[PDB]
Amino acid sequence: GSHMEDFVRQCFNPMIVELAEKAMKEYGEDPKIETNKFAAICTHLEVCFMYSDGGSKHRFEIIEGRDRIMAWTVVNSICNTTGVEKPKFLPDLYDYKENRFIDIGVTRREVHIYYLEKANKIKSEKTHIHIFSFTGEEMATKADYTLDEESRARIKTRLFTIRQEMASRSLWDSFRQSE
Numbered sequence: 091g092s093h094m095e096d097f098v099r100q101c102f103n104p105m106i107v108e109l110a111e112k113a114m115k116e117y118g119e120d121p122k123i124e125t126n127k128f129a130a131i132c133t134h135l136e137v138c139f140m141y142s143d144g145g146s147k148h149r150f151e152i153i154e155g156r157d158r159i160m161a162w163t164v165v166n167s168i169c170n171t172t173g174v175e176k177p178k179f180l181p182d183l184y185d186y187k188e189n190r191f192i193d194i195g196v197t198r199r200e201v202h203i204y205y206l207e208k209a210n211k212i213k214s215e216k217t218h219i220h221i222f223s224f225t226g227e228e229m230a231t232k233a234d235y236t237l238d239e240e241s242r243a244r245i246k247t248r249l250f251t252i253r254q255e256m257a258s259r260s261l262w263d264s265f266r267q268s269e
């Protein structure tokens with residue numbers, strides 16, 4: 091029973107905690123032990139949800155948070171109807187306006203180094219990439235940040251609030267050193 095696990099459950103809403111737990115049990119990981127990964131997945135999930143709320147009513151299809159089979163099912167439907175290439179790795183969203191998959195990144199390090207590793211790993215040069223850092227920087231493919239400035243600023247504010255809440259509980263150091 092770690093301090094980090096209790097902080098996560100009272101900091102993020104229960105629907106996000108539920109999906110993160112279900113996500114971690116696929117791939118076979120324990121939220122009670124891998125506490126920093128538990129906090130990272132909840133954070134990445136909330137950012138994806140906030141991101142999808144930034145566009146118009148039904149601009150974004152949400153891929154993250156679904157079980158692996160259903161997420162791939164929607165990816166197949168999106169590809170077999172828009173003609174967009176099928177990614178090798180599951181993205182996070184699909185932009186019906188810009189007609190591209192998006193993988194959102196949340197990092198505790200430099201947005202520069204994290205971007206390079208993300209593009210190398212997915213090996214899908216057509217999946218748009220957008221990174222957020224806990225300090226307030228962001229990096230997007232082709233410098234195309236998809237959303238307007240106000241939607242991204244809300245995400246950066248929430249990210250800095252999360253880091254403050256862990257720092258005030260002396261859990262930020264172990265979190266930052268966990269990536």
Ligand SMILES: O=C(NCCS(=O)(=O)c1ccccc1)c1nc([C@@H]2CCCN2C(=O)CSc2ccccc2Cl)[nH]c(=O)c1O
Pocket residue numbers: 113114117130131134154155179180181182193194195196211212
């Ligand atoms: O979707 C992700 N992983 C699915 C499992 S998860 O939902 O439990 C989870 C969701 C989010 C985070 C962890 C775990 C996902 N992973 C990652 C993590 C951290 C960076 C490397 N990295 C991987 O694991 C590489 S693999 C991968 C890479 C791109 C797309 C899809 C995959 Cl699979 N960073 C992300 O930005 C991210 O979107």
Ligand SMILES: [Mn+2]
Pocket residue numbers: 154180181182
């Ligand atoms: Mn993802």
Ligand SMILES: [Mn+2]
Pocket residue numbers: 134182193194195
């Ligand atoms: Mn992602």
